[PDB]
Design a protein around this nucleic acid. Structure first.
Ligand SMILES: [Mg+2]
Ligand SMILES: [Mg+2]
Ligand SMILES: [Mg+2]
Ligand SMILES: [Zn+2]
Lengths: 94, 134, 38, 136, 135
RNA sequence: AGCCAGGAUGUUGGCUUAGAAGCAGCCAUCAUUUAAAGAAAGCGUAAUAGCUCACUGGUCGAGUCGGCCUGCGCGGAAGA
């Protein structure tokens, strides 16, 4: 059972998102259902390792944000053009 | 110390035996008819492997062994030559029984703890030479 | 001695060694395998 | 050797080669050879590399070529001055941007695909890297 | 090499054999070709004796289960165990003439009675008759 | 990692060949006894023999192996 630690993003747009990745973090988004989308930021190495196991893309994951647990599934993923890296992830509330 | 596979009641020839152990210091005629003398009891036309054992004074002893698996399998399949392409071209059939017989002879010569094991080895040969077990 | 830009182990008895700032292949088995980067 | 069978026009502006690649995932095979650098691949290069990887697997499995050299390149020969009309078309290139999967492959063990793609990459004028299929 | 699941299974089996047997003879067997081993195997199967080379670490685990814990110290150096599961002795016998004859390896300590048996004095087991001698 | 020892049986596998025995080439690559030992990784022979590797028991006693993201360097580097 995957557990991902996230903080809500304080900024948005291109500048903020590139600064995240220069800092070994990367943006992501949680949408679905009744609640509003929740823009977040993730630790790159931690999620990189996780998603190298097929289970990630097919299991109910739990994102922890301010000590709250959100149950999600991976929905889309943007990868770097040619490095073993993640640019962004969509999670849909499960 | 040399190892050959010689025809039962036959020995002496130059390209076959002569030169081979002849160039080690071995008395040809002696071994020829001693070999034949003891291999008289073998069935006709069974190629039998002999281990020749020579000592510094050119004198020698030897042990006779059971014929090769390939040989017995050739004879059991009623054929003359193994497949040129084993398991791509099949060239015949030995029953499980024939396997077992050959296995008991070669059992006198195997290292199998059981009939089944020996038989499996003989099967291994039979496979190796494109003979099917039928 | 083979002298070239790309030096490698050519067999299991080849060793890469650096001597005096220069990369080399030394072999204990085949003299032809001996190289110097250059 | 790849070439468009026919085209609307014979000749093409030089143009530029900015941007990241489209078609960055392994979409047909199991493994892929991906461009890490920017540049032009000629039809002869693409061919040389296709041969190499295909020797390497002993024509087993299956191979896909994701790029196609559809850009005509012209040249002026020796001892001709500038102007007097655009040069003659001599060969064809594909424009390559970082991230393009160049070749794909499957039906072979990964170890053999890496070797084959290693041999092929030595024929190409742009750095490349080895990639794999991914769920999503 | 040998995964942990392997070695656990190797122990279990050697231990189960140890429960059924009645006389264990331990020897060095280093420096003997496989043909003379293969020969000793036909002599073990013939005489109903179970033969194994096993890691000294791994044997210590089998032993402890009972009643061979005296043999621990016999597991320094290359080790060959001999389990006479049907009848007692005959292995102790067999190993020594085989030991003497081949002037390679040595023989360490045997064990019967839950008592370690000292290299020299093993001559006890190596002279115990047949079962099948009391008649 | 180093060092000791083993690396066996059918069997010289089948075909081919003057010979082809793990080791020119072609096909097969099973099975046995195994702690382990490929119908053989390389040298070797006219063919054997002979050396060695894979693999395994022993000794030693706490680390060891090599892919990933990255910083700075090294070779590649010859001219009047
Ligand atoms: Mg900007
Ligand atoms: Mg110097
Ligand atoms: Mg070691
Ligand atoms: Zn070398």
């Amino acid at each position: 059972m995957f557990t991902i630690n996230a903080e809500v993003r304080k900024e948005q747009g291109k500048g903020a998102s590139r600064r995240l990745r220069a800092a070994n973090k990367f943006p992501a988004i949680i949408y679905g259902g009744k609640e509003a989308p929740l823009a977040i930021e993730l630790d790159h190495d931690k999620v990189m390792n996780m998603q190298a196991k097929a289970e990630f893309y097919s299991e109910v994951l739990t994102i922890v944000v301010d000590g709250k647990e959100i149950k999600v599934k991976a929905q889309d993923v943007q990868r770097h053009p040619y490095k073993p890296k993640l640019q962004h992830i969509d999670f849909v509330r499960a | 110390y040399v190892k050959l596979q010689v025809a039962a009641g036959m020995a002496n020839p130059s390209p076959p035996v002569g030169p081979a152990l002849g160039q080690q210091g071995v008395n040809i005629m002696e071994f020829c008819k001693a070999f034949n003398a003891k291999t008289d009891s073998i069935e006709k036309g069974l190629p039998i492997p002999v281990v020749i054992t020579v000592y510094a004074d050119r004198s020698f002893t030897f042990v006779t062994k059971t014929p090769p698996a390939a040989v017995l399998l050739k004879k059991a399949a009623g054929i003359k030559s193994g497949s040129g392409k084993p398991n791509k071209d099949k060239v015949g059939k030995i029953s499980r029984a024939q396997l077992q017989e050959i296995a008991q002879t070669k059992a006198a010569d195997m290292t199998g703890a059981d009939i089944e094991a020996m038989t499996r080895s003989i099967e291994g040969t039979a496979r190796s030479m494109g003979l099917v077990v039928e | 001695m083979k002298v070239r830009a790309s030096v490698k182990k050519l067999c299991r008895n080849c060793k890469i060694v650096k001597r005096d700032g220069v990369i080399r292949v030394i072999c204990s088995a085949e003299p032809k395998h001996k190289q110097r980067q250059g | 050797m790849l070439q468009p069978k026919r085209t609307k026009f014979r000749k093409m502006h030089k143009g530029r080669n900015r941007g990241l690649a489209q078609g960055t995932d392994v979409s047909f095979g199991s493994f892929g050879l991906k461009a890490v650098g920017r540049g032009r691949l000629t039809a002869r290069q693409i061919e040389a590399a296709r041969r190499a990887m295909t020797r390497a697997v002993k024509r087993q499995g299956k191979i896909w070529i994701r790029v196609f050299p559809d850009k005509p390149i012209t040249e002026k020969p020796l001892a001709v001055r500038m102007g007097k009309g655009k040069g003659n078309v001599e060969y064809w290139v594909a424009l390559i941007q970082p991230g393009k999967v160049l070749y794909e492959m499957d039906g072979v063990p990964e170890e053999l695909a890496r070797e084959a793609f290693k041999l092929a990459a030595a024929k190409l004028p742009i750095k490349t890297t080895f990639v794999t299929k991914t769920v999503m | 090499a040998l995964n942990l699941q392997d070695k656990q299974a190797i122990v279990a089996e050697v231990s189960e054999v140890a429960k059924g047997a009645l006389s264990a003879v331990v020897a060095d067997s280093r420096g003997v070709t496989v043909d003379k081993m293969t020969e000793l195997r036909k002599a073990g199967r013939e005489a109903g004796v179970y033969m194994r080379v096993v890691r000294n670490t791994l044997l210590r685990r089998a032993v402890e289960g009972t009643p061979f814990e005296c043999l621990k110290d016999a597991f320094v150096g290359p080790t060959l165990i001999a389990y006479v599961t049907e009848h007692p002795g005959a292995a102790a016998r067999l190993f020594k003439e085989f030991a003497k004859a081949n002037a390679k390896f040595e023989v360490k300590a045997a064990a019967f009675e839950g008592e370690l048996i000292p290299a020299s004095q093993i001559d006890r087991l190596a002279t115990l008759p047949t079962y099948e001698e009391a008649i």
